[PDB]
Design a protein around this ligand. Structure first.
Ligand SMILES: *[C@@H]1O[C@H](CO)[C@@H](O[C@@H]2O[C@H](CO)[C@@H](O[C@@H]3O[C@H](CO[C@@H]4O[C@H](CO)[C@@H](O)[C@H](O)[C@@H]4O)[C@@H](O)[C@H](O[C@H]4O[C@H](CO)[C@@H](O)[C@H](O)[C@@H]4O)[C@@H]3O)[C@H](O)[C@H]2NC(C)=O)[C@H](O)[C@H]1NC(C)=O
Ligand SMILES: *[C@@H]1O[C@H](CO)[C@@H](O[C@@H]2O[C@H](CO)[C@@H](O[C@@H]3O[C@H](CO[C@H]4O[C@H](CO)[C@@H](O)[C@H](O)[C@@H]4O)[C@@H](O)[C@H](O[C@H]4O[C@H](CO)[C@@H](O)[C@H](O)[C@@H]4O)[C@@H]3O)[C@H](O)[C@H]2NC(C)=O)[C@H](O)[C@H]1NC(C)=O
Ligand SMILES: *[C@@H]1O[C@H](CO)[C@@H](O[C@@H]2O[C@H](CO)[C@@H](O[C@@H]3O[C@H](CO[C@H]4O[C@H](CO)[C@@H](O)[C@H](O)[C@@H]4O)[C@@H](O)[C@H](O[C@H]4O[C@H](CO)[C@@H](O)[C@H](O)[C@@H]4O)[C@@H]3O)[C@H](O)[C@H]2NC(C)=O)[C@H](O)[C@H]1NC(C)=O
Ligand SMILES: *[C@@H]1O[C@H](CO)[C@@H](O[C@@H]2O[C@H](CO)[C@@H](O[C@@H]3O[C@H](CO)[C@@H](O)[C@H](O)[C@@H]3O)[C@H](O)[C@H]2NC(C)=O)[C@H](O)[C@H]1NC(C)=O
Ligand SMILES: *[C@@H]1O[C@H](CO)[C@@H](O[C@H]2O[C@H](CO)[C@@H](O)[C@H](O)[C@H]2NC(C)=O)[C@H](O)[C@H]1NC(C)=O
Ligand SMILES: *[C@@H]1O[C@H](CO)[C@@H](O)[C@H](O)[C@H]1NC(C)=O
Ligand SMILES: *[C@@H]1O[C@H](CO)[C@@H](O)[C@H](O)[C@H]1NC(C)=O
Ligand SMILES: *[C@@H]1O[C@H](CO)[C@@H](O)[C@H](O)[C@H]1NC(C)=O
Ligand SMILES: *[C@H]1O[C@H](CO)[C@@H](O)[C@H](O)[C@H]1NC(C)=O
Ligand SMILES: *[C@H]1O[C@H](CO)[C@@H](O)[C@H](O)[C@H]1NC(C)=O
Ligand SMILES: *[C@H]1O[C@H](CO)[C@@H](O)[C@H](O)[C@H]1NC(C)=O
Lengths: 172, 318, 319, 172, 319, 172
């Protein structure tokens, strides 16, 4: 997609993630662990909510009938009316199709971007203490137990604290 | 040690369309075209009138089937298929314009003409084509003026409706076109027939067609109706000598109303602002594929069965 | 030091297109979206069509000589040409354009005989040098010019009734003759005051012959105007008249639906199209079109624009 | 532009690349080579094709004539028809322009995004064995023959296989 | 530790605008796209215009006195006002609104003489209190009220023909008098039955004066209903009649094209516009407009929005 | 937003900046300084000016009156005209809303991209001499005076000079 993340360097979605749109999976001595990210998930949801709300409210214009259901309409005016309503119908069908194809592209792209901005936010958190997988993961060059993984998810990880140790490990 | 970022997914995605792709799979999506309708007329919140068997034009001229609809107020008027306008057979010049006008109104008031007639005129002419009380009767708002003496030349007469109101009034009248000369002679006498009708913003003359034609409701004659608007302070005079169906009341149209044509049943327990021949469309959705003929405040008609809008990211399952 | 460099392609001179923010954007490629080209022919492959040539649609119903090969038939496409003839004897039809449109929305025409007959006091076989067939004088094929058999006599009061016994509506036409002089009128109908009434269950009207001097058209100062209506299944329509009626000997029934095209372009049976205009056919896959605002069929939408090109490549950044 | 690559930090395009939309130029001991990337190229073309496919699709509405070509229309109805047809034309002309301007933009930005996606992909493969010169290249701190070059393009370059040396060359 | 930081500007009070996903997005600057403002003025600079004043366009053709300065002329812009007068002697035109619009599509009006003349028992210059010229009595400048020279005398049978010898079509008008009483009828035209027949090569009809009391308008209980047609180049048109016709002295020729405006807003020769409405002029560069759904000329499109703001800056993020 | 910078990894905007739309703040031994960046400021301005010029393009279709202001129109044709005009007005009102909603999003996001393209530009100049703050700043691992800071601002900074010094500082 546009931002290279969803259907990009992340090979697939996680069907396991039932409680959120985006999140983290880890791998350490103590085991696996999946956990959704609240802010990313919320930023994508709100923008959609916004789209939806904009698309209910429809014209308060009140139309009268120009065609009898139960009696015949003189032929010439009948034809003008037919030609006009069909042209109107073609305009709205085309607007509708375009609107929905367009917003669908924007929704897909907006979701791709949020995924990236999470990856980016974390990248900067971790600073010189980790390297990138190319598949969407960060190989951390210190012992990052469950407490350390949690601080990464919660935005409370201090790169200074494991830095030295990481700068040592990366140069083997 | 290794931390990975990811997004969610489902097993069975949903197909939507994009600019670039006919077959895009997303986690979720929802419909933007309404395909459902309520096969009822949602009348909650509305002062409505069901005309039943009464055709709008009939409410102005007073057809027996329109007896319960000769005056009133409403914000919503409902016309049914096969409604009756003409008990005695005929037609109204500019009939559909008049129908739409009555169906654009919020009610009707009737005001008397005042016309009186010399004693060599019978103004109580009735017909078995218009039965009221199982008597021969007539359009309630008009009078069939005939000579009290069979064969007698109907007298030259004049009648002038003056509008003293502060709103224009809708006046109708008829011209009788007999099936034969004998019927013409018996009713209006043997002289040639002229009827004239002028205001200061309307002028027009009429003469009775006489010819054989097939019976409708038992009758080969016809009455055809004509209509105009009299402005406040203005007069409309009828000079005539035979074959005028003269008004005994003119109409005044009040406010605004939504006109609906449908045979669906009324229901006072639902609300709607959009109607069609099959009923009531209550969507929040912006589009609709039920019919290109609707009235009220409606989603726009589109030529599409379904248009799904993405409510989730691109779905990439495992 | 060793290197790997990423990049993209470019071309020598690019193609200019418009964006939201830039009137002059250069891209590596583009393609047109507005069709400026037409085929100068009516593309009739896959269609049952009738080219009326010289015959006007209304002449099909009344039976003008130029319409003899078009009195009945079926078609899914009907093609009218410029200057076609409806009226050999000069006249006009009331609500003409509505009638023409109706014929041109149709898929066929059947004819059904009225069965009208007339006493030997009426003569029904009169003709005119204005309506010619086989080098001889004739008349609208589907109608008859009733006059008095013995000149000068008052045309009898006559009743003629046609009955639709079918299950579809029929279109009936009649004429009213408008003489060019008093003597003429008297010669062929008598001195009496003339009247023609016409009534069905859903229509009636009266008609009186206008008489007066006026210009010759196709050699005639007289005129015959046409009138029409629809007679519903089971309904009858009666004509009461004492001079001046041009009575129908047959009535018509329009069948099915078709597409009506007005164009002088020639017919080509070996190409197909769904979109036609005065100048020919428009066979493009393109969404828009700047040839004409008057098209028929399933057509790209008319736009006020010479060209609108859609990029099919990236920004062109030449060396 | 939007993704900052085409008409961006990449200064210009290569007129000598007729076999693709995006690609590589390398310089190593054995000299110089150029080669297209098939994948990135097809992702850009397939998006274009989707656009064209969508643009030729048909409205099936059949219109009849409401104006005679060969005879004159009553004046009032003629003016209503003209008014209506001209309004409908202004709507379609505006839509056509807007559609094409809008798509042109997106086509451009999408092409840019594929260039950036390809570049990022390379950056992650190389990992710590190379550094960015700002003009769209990676200066590589270890001997990479044409076969190693072909691995990077092949997407099989294993940075571990060259790492210890490349660190030596970078910090030296 | 030294440091450089990147950033963007902001302001203390931004503007709300709408995006796709947010009715309340704050940005640094924005600007209006819907025009709410009108000039209470008909902006006429660079136009050669005719303000009809109290003359109604139809009065230009029949020659009401209110229209005496607008009988002929040229213009690209014709301005009709409220309560303009068409009929001094009361009546009405058939297809009145169609004719008005024809005059208002036009760019000028030429008059051509009919050259109609009349016998000695006709008074070809009936006049009336209701059409005041110079104080006293007068009549439509372009028509002639024909009546008998002797009060109760039978008005004589008579025939006039206008010939169009020009290369463009001429618009011909005439009237039919319906008297107020059977004693008027006989005064003006004697005791016979009256018949007026009109025939060109494109048109015919009959008309019959109908006597009948009607309310008084400008003092008159009688009326004259007006008729018109187009006479094609090379064609003639014949009137035949014996009392009740109002005949034409001149016919009109409509010249070129103009823009028709209905408004009581005052003319200003110092401002220019291409968009007009009832309340004046609209020149705005904006693409949309909320003043009126009824405009003429080249116009921004009417929308149902008070305001629509287009961002001209980035998101605003205060401190 | 889409490119993650404005109201993104950068926390807020500078009211102090009047001389432009994008720009720099620094800190060295000689104190602190603020300054606009020409390129990205005008790049953004020009794209806005571009949208405006599109908005005031004169649709030149000349329309006549189909409704008398001073007389009554026959009621049936009057109803057809009203139906036509009211439908035409719903189309234009809806396109107008959509046009503006859409351009405003595109403007917002374009601006967010120009911020990001600038940050990515500075980052690649600094090469291995600095590290990312993650709040939009770059911490520079050598002494960088006013001339050093101007060199950066104007794309005149050479990493080769300060490299081995900056590497001392990063590792210790
Ligand atoms: C097609 O659409 C047009 C445009 O909507 C319709 O025309 C409007 O509706 C009718 C025209 O027949 C008019 O309605 C009445 O207008 C009165 C106007 O009076 C004044 O004008 C202006 C505003 O127009 C104001 O400054 C003042 O208010 C003036 O007094 C108005 O007063 C009246 O309201 C009252 O009428 C009833 C009595 O009937 C009262 O009892 C009640 O209290 C009510 O308030 C009406 O609104 C209207 O002016 C027209 N507007 C325009 C722009 O033309 C056509 O009728 C439509 N055509 C068809 C065939 O449906
Ligand atoms: C402006 O547009 C409207 C809407 O399109 C047109 O009205 C339609 O006109 C067509 C006729 O051309 C009608 O189609 C007919 O359907 C019949 C079936 O009965 C239907 O009746 C009701 C309406 O009362 C329909 O809504 C409902 O679905 C019913 O099923 C067919 O039997 C008709 O003719 C058939 O003739 C032979 C029979 O021997 C068949 O072989 C043919 O196939 C043909 O179908 C016909 O098809 C349609 O009912 C009308 N729709 C409505 C909603 O009224 C206007 O006429 C148009 N005006 C123009 C161009 O002037
Ligand atoms: C609805 O809209 C249509 C479409 O615009 C109008 O129809 C047009 O009417 C204009 C006049 O306003 C016509 O233009 C005139 O045509 C002459 C050229 O001949 C044309 O002939 C054929 C038709 O047989 C055209 O299709 C073809 O293009 C030819 O070019 C010009 O000579 C006229 O200009 C001259 O007029 C005067 C004389 O009056 C001269 O003295 C001047 O020198 C001046 O130059 C003019 O251009 C136009 O052809 C019509 N087009 C069509 C397609 O019919 C309808 O009238 C309009 N409806 C209503 C009710 O207003
Ligand atoms: C149109 O014309 C036809 C034919 O004239 C009319 O049909 C007639 O309908 C009547 C009753 O509607 C029928 O007569 C009845 O049937 C028998 C027939 O012998 C008779 O014995 C009964 O006592 C009764 O009168 C008959 O079917 C038919 N009559 C004739 C003479 O043909 C029709 O009514 C006319 N008008 C329409 C259909 O609107
Ligand atoms: C209108 O009237 C004139 C005048 O009589 C008719 O005849 C004139 O035009 C003819 C052209 O064919 C000439 O050949 C005639 O000699 C000429 N007569 C004159 C001037 O006295 C003309 O044909 C008539 N037009 C129509 C359509 O009837
Ligand atoms: C996580 O950090 C947040 C602030 O980001 C704080 O409110 C919360 O107490 C912390 N929770 C844990 C489990 O450390
Ligand atoms: C009409 O009404 C009466 C008599 O009909 C008359 O006195 C009055 O002056 C007239 N008013 C108008 C406006 O015609
Ligand atoms: C990738 O390309 C190199 C080029 O030399 C080739 O040797 C190798 O086989 C390729 N690897 C795979 C797994 O296809
Ligand atoms: C779409 O369905 C899924 C699962 O039911 C859910 O996430 C979402 O709420 C749905 N969308 C709407 C508008 O309810
Ligand atoms: C544009 O032309 C180029 C030739 O350079 C080619 O890539 C492509 O086929 C063209 N576009 C289309 C739609 O064919
Ligand atoms: C927006 O306003 C600012 C200052 O308030 C000004 O610089 C700019 O020109 C304005 N642009 C508009 C109103 O289009």
């Amino acid at each position: 997609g546009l931002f290279g993340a969803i259907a990009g360097f992340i090979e697939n979605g996680w069907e396991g993630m039932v409680d959120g749109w985006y999140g983290f999976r880890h791998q350490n001595a103590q085991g696996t662990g999946q956990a959704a990210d609240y802010k990313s998930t919320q930023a994508a949801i709100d923008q959609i909510t916004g789209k939806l709300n904009r698309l209910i409210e429809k014209t308060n214009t009140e139309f009268e009938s120009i065609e009898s259901e139960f009696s015949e309409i003189e032929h010439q005016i009948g034809n003008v009316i037919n030609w006009t309503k069909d042209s109107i119908t073609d305009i709205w069908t085309y607007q509708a199709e375009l609107l929905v194809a367009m917003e669908n592209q924007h929704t897909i792209d907006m979701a791709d971007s949020e995924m990236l901005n999470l990856y980016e936010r974390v990248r900067k958190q971790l600073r010189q203490n980790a390297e990138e997988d190319g598949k969407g993961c960060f190989e951390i060059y210190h012992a990052c137990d469950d407490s350390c993984m949690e601080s990464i998810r919660n935005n409370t990880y201090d790169h200074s604290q494991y830095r030295e140790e990481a700068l040592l490990n990366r140069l083997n | 040690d290794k931390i990975c970022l990811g997004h969610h997914a489902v097993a069975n995605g949903t197909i939507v369309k994009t600019l670039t792709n006919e077959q895009e799979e997303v986690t979720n999506a929802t419909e933007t075209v309404e395909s459902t309708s309520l096969d009822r007329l949602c009348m909650k919140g509305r002062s409505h009138k069901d005309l039943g068997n009464c055709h709008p034009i009939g409410m102005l001229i007073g057809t027996p089937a329109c007896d319960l609809h000769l005056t009133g107020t409403w914000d919503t008027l409902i016309e049914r298929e096969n409604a009756i306008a003409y008990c005695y057979p005929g037609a109204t010049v500019n009939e559909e314009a008049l129908r739409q006008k009555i169906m654009e109104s919020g009610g009707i008031s009737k005001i008397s003409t005042g016309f009186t007639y010399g004693s060599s005129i019978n103004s109580a002419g009735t017909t078995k084509a218009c039965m009221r009380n199982g008597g021969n009767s007539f359009y309630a708002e008009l009078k069939w003026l005939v000579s009290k003496s069979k064969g007698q030349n109907f007298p030259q007469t004049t009648n002038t409706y003056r509008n003293t109101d502060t709103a224009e009034h809708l006046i109708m009248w008829g011209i009788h076109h007999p099936s034969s000369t004998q019927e013409k002679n018996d009713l209006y006498g043997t002289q040639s027939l002229s009827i004239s009708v002028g205001s200061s913003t309307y002028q027009s003359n009429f003469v009775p067609v006489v010819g054989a034609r097939p019976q409708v409701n038992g009758q080969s004659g016809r009455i055809d109706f004509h209509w105009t608007l009299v402005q406040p302070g203005d007069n409309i005079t009828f000079s005539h000598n035979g074959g005028l169906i003269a008004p005994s009341r003119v109409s005044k149209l009040i406010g605004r109303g939504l006109g609906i044509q449908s045979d669906a049943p009324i229901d006072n327990n639902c609300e709607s602002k959009c109607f069609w021949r099959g009923g009531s469309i209550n969507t929040r959705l912006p589009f609709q594929n039920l019919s290109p003929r609707t009235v009220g405040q409606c989603p726009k008609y589109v030529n599409k069965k379904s248009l799904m809008l993405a409510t989730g990211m691109r779905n990439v399952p495992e």
